[PDB]
């Protein structure tokens, strides 16, 4: 029952198969356009007459 449950199957003297890890890809400069929105809003609060 535990040999057929999920990944990491076991039975022949060692438990092998179905490894699980991560790669972590990133760019991190994607919200730059979003940053533009933020900084323009700042000037927005600085420039409409109270």
């Amino acid at each position: 029952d535990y040999a057929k449950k999920r990944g990491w199957v076991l039975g022949p003297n060692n438990y092998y198969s179905f490894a699980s890890q991560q790669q972590k890809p990133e760019d991190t400069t994607i919200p730059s356009t979003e940053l533009a929105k933020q900084v323009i809003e700042y000037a927005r609060q600085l420039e409409m007459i109270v």
């Binding site: 356009t33 533009a36 929105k37 323009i40 809003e41 000037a43 927005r44 420039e47 409409m48």
Partner: protein, 94 residues
């Protein structure tokens, strides 16, 4: 040939393409750096020659169409992001 995404070229492809030996590659690219057509640098620990600049060459019609396509790809984003600054700021820029 490579489109400046991975401009770095390994020594193995240099010695396979130019059919020169293993230890004779570096002086060869030094000779290129002697003249001025090539403006790269060489890293010996990983043994890779990084590339910065290549002297221009003659181009034909299909290359001109590809250049025009890339220039249009650059031409669209200027308008597309001028709409960003003009649309989100009306009464500041007046």
């Amino acid at each position: 040939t490579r489109p400046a995404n991975h401009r770095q070229l390994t020594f193995e492809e240099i010695a396979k393409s130019a059919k020169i030996t293993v230890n004779e590659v570096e002086l060869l690219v030094m000779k290129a750096l002697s003249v001025g057509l090539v403006k790269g640098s060489i890293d010996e620990v990983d043994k890779r020659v990084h590339m910065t600049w290549v002297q221009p060459r003659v181009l034909d019609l299909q290359q001109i169409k590809g250049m025009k396509d890339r220039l249009e790809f650059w031409c669209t984003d200027v308008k597309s992001m001028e709409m960003l600054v003009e649309h989100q700021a009306h009464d500041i820029l007046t």
